[PDB]
Design a binder for this molecule. Structure first.
Ligand SMILES: *[C@@H]1O[C@H](CO)[C@@H](O)[C@H](O)[C@H]1NC(C)=O
Ligand SMILES: [Ca+2]
Ligand SMILES: [Ca+2]
Ligand SMILES: [Ca+2]
Length: 108
């Protein structure tokens, strides 16, 4: 069910974009602090892709709005859901939306 609470927005296709997660009845973004291919691989597999192609820092697919829900995401890279990775307290970040994280998943 966790796959319903993550999404990729404003990419060239559904395989890529700004990462947004659903928490407390709202979509919010993910800070790029410590954002790396281990975290991206977890996101990509959650969404049904084979894995991560590349991750991007500094709002590569534009700034989100609203809450920044996750910061300092520290996935090992093999988790079945990003919500079992280590990360910040929900909504507690030292980030702005200029730091919103993104991913391109291996698909094409
Ligand atoms: C979407 O991403 C592009 C870069 O590919 C960015 O320039 C643009 O701001 C983003 N779109 C939004 C919603 O602004
Ligand atoms: Ca940063
Ligand atoms: Ca941080
Ligand atoms: Ca990380």
């Amino acid at each position: 069910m966790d796959f319903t609470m993550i999404r990729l927005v404003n990419g060239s296709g559904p395989h890529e974009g700004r990462v947004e997660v659903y928490h407390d009845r709202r979509w919010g973004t993910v800070c790029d602090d410590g954002w790396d291919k281990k975290d991206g691989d977890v996101v990509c597999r959650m969404l049904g892709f084979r894995g991560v192609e590349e991750v991007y820092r500094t709002a590569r697919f534009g700034q989100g709005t609203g809450r920044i829900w996750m910061d300092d995401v520290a996935c090992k890279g093999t988790e079945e859901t990003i919500f079992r990775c280590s990360f910040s307290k929900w909504g507690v970040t030292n980030c702005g939306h200029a730091e919103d994280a993104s991913v391109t998943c291996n698909r094409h």
